[PDB]
């Protein structure tokens, strides 16, 4: 019987730029609440599982521990900043003003939503006045009234700005917090986004199962010195078998012999 099962995978290089969440220092432009496409990179979610220091991270359609198994064409990272009273109401299948009247999410929207404390860093003692609301849709220059002013003072004609009452003094339930949605899309495209695939320590000259980048087999390995360039997989001098296999870290060429 084979002794133990073995998997060997290459070192991780492409880290998702989630660091724009840990080290975000500034707010986005008014037109551009942060909606970014994420592709051609490996998404490391392992830190989020055991971080446990942030307000919420609840996410639906996929079990948390199987993210590395699934592969998606695209990831949309949509980040806003909203107040606390709506944090439990930002969820697929629920109601609300912003989620319904600005951009639609499907009732069974599968994706992963996190809410972040900004109490001691981004909150302002005098109040940050950067928060606006879009309130109305009737059907599928912007004036709050119905009649156009045409540059003439009168009814439904207003002043550019009056001081607005935004204050931090409100209670704990009422501070604003940051919201980020990571949406996974699986569509008709070559698989480019893959989760990190962890490997183990290597043991030689024992009857073992081996799994090299998905290549599964069983046997015991011996070193072969035949001339293969590192990028070479297929060749026809023996024409019969997947002769040799190459570790990603160590470029050594190993052939297999079956056990009893």
């Amino acid at each position, epitope marked *: 019987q084979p002794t133990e099962s073995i998997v060997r995978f290459p070192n991780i290089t492409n880290l998702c730029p989630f660091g724009e969440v840990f080290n975000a220092t500034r707010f986005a432009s008014v037109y551009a609440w942060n909606r970014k496409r994420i592709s051609n990179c490996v998404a490391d979610y392992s830190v989020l599982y055991n971080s446990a220091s942030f307000s919420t991270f609840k996410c639906y359609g996929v079990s948390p521990t199987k993210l590395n198994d699934l592969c998606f064409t695209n990831v949309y990272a949509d980040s806003f900043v909203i107040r606390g009273d709506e944090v439990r109401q930002i969820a697929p299948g629920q109601t609300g003003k912003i989620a319904d009247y600005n951009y639609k999410l499907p009732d069974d929207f599968t994706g992963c939503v996190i809410a972040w404390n900004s109490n001691n860093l981004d909150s302002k003692v005098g109040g940050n006045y950067n928060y606006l609301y879009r*309130l109305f849709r009737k059907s599928n220059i912007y004036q709050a*009234g119905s009649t156009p002013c045409n540059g003439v003072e009168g009814f*439904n004609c207003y002043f550019p700005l009056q001081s607005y009452g935004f204050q931090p003094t409100n209670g704990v339930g009422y501070q604003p917090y940051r919201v980020v949605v990571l949406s996974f899309e699986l569509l008709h495209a070559p698989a480019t986004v893959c989760g990190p695939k962890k490997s183990t320590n290597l043991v030689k000259n024992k009857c073992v199962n081996f799994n090299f980048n998905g290549l599964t087999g069983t046997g015991v390995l011996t070193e072969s010195n035949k001339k293969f360039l590192p990028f070479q997989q297929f060749g026809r001098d023996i024409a019969d078998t997947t002769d040799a296999v190459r570790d990603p870290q160590t470029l050594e060429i190993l052939d297999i012999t079956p056990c009893s």
Partner: nanobody, 128 residues
Framework: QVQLQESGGGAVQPGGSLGLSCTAS????????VGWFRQAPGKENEGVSC????????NYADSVKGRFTISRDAAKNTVYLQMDSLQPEDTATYYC??????????????????????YGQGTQVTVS
């Protein structure tokens, strides 16, 4: 925009009655909810009454249940609140308010202070 005018406040003696009136303009509040909120010194802003004229469905705060009656006049386009057996806790400045989304049914009126988008000047009622 929407403009609100409250009137009818004053001084009352406990056991009496008072009549508040809310006049709305800039929007047709005949198929939408309009309500009365209060704020008192040392007390949080609390909604006390609301009426939806679409079927005139009524709601009152638990603190005011069984004591106040709210009605809506289409001909006057106003909201009239009648207060019977007033108590000292009813002494407050009253605001007339409405929901951003106009409702079209028997919806009970929300009495959370966050419920107002446009707000009037308010009228004082002192039960003393």
């Amino acid at each position: 925009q929407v403009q609100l005018q409250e009137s009818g406040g004053g001084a009352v003696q406990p056991g009496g009655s008072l009549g508040l009136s809310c006049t709305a303009s800039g929007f047709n509040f005949e198929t939408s909810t309009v309500g009365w909120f209060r704020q008192a010194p040392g007390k949080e802003n609390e909604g006390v009454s609301c009426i939806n004229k679409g079927y005139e469905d009524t709601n009152y705060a638990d603190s005011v249940k069984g004591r106040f009656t709210i009605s809506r006049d289409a001909a006057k386009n106003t909201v009239y609140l009648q207060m019977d057996s007033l108590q000292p806790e009813d002494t407050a400045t009253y605001y007339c308010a409405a929901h951003n989304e106009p409702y079209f049914c028997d919806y009970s009126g929300r009495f959370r202070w966050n419920e107002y988008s446009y707000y009037g000047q308010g009228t004082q009622v002192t039960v003393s």
